[PDB]
Structures are given as structure tokens and as C-alpha cells.
Amino acid sequence: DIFEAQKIEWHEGAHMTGVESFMTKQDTTGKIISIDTSSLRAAGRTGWEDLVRKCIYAFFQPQGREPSYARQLFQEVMTRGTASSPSYRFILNDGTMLSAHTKCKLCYPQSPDMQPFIMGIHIID
């Protein structure tokens, strides 16, 4: 049904072959409450912890004079229920330049004991 369909896209995001990504869950104050890295750890690439840390820091870093993409997306996802960033870049510990973009959605769980939350997917370009 409608509640179940909400989970389809995020289950698919957790098993994408050929795409480097991770997912986050934020409460509605914006605080990150979980980070799912199972796709990165399965793909056996070493340096995933550094990739995730650097990607998240770039996501929350101010964009010159504008707010960070994290702020812009959080503001938009609370008002309209979905949001997306353009690409942002970061440098791994070995000097490699990478870029990423983020998409997120407000999710309304069926269980009365759970609060709404924001699911985010961060895709390496």
C-alpha cells in the first residue's frame, strides 16, 4: 500500500550495483541519527570511512555567501517533503578529488510509535 511504497526507493538505494553511495537518516530537527554504509563496505574499497567523513563535512560546509547544501536541503525538505543538492567536491586523505550530490525525502512511518524522519542518499559522481 501507500506506506509500503515509501520504503521501495530506499531499499533500492541500499543495494545499487555500480554506484558509490551511502544513506543517512535525520530527525526533523536535522540531527543525523543513523548512517548506512553497507554498500561501501560490501564493495571492499578501503578508505570508505574517510570518504564518508569528507563527504558529510563538505555537505554541511557554507557555500561561499549562501548556506550549506545541508541547510538548504533541510529547509526545503521540511516545507515541501523532498529536496536535492547539486554536486559538491571534497578531497580524500590520499589527495583524490571527488564530487557528490545529495537527495532527500521526508518519510511518514506507519507505526504510531515512530516520528517522521528525513532519508538522505549521497551519491559519488
Binding site: T29, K31, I32, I35, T37, E49, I56, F60
Partner: peptide, 15 residues
Amino acid sequence: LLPPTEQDLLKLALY
């Protein structure tokens, strides 16, 4: 919102 602190991130990986 507040960005995660280094301890927030540490916890997110630890558990």
C-alpha cells in the same frame, strides 16, 4: 540545523 560534531560522527560509525 547544527552540523554533526566529530563525536556525533564517531558515534554514528561506532554503533
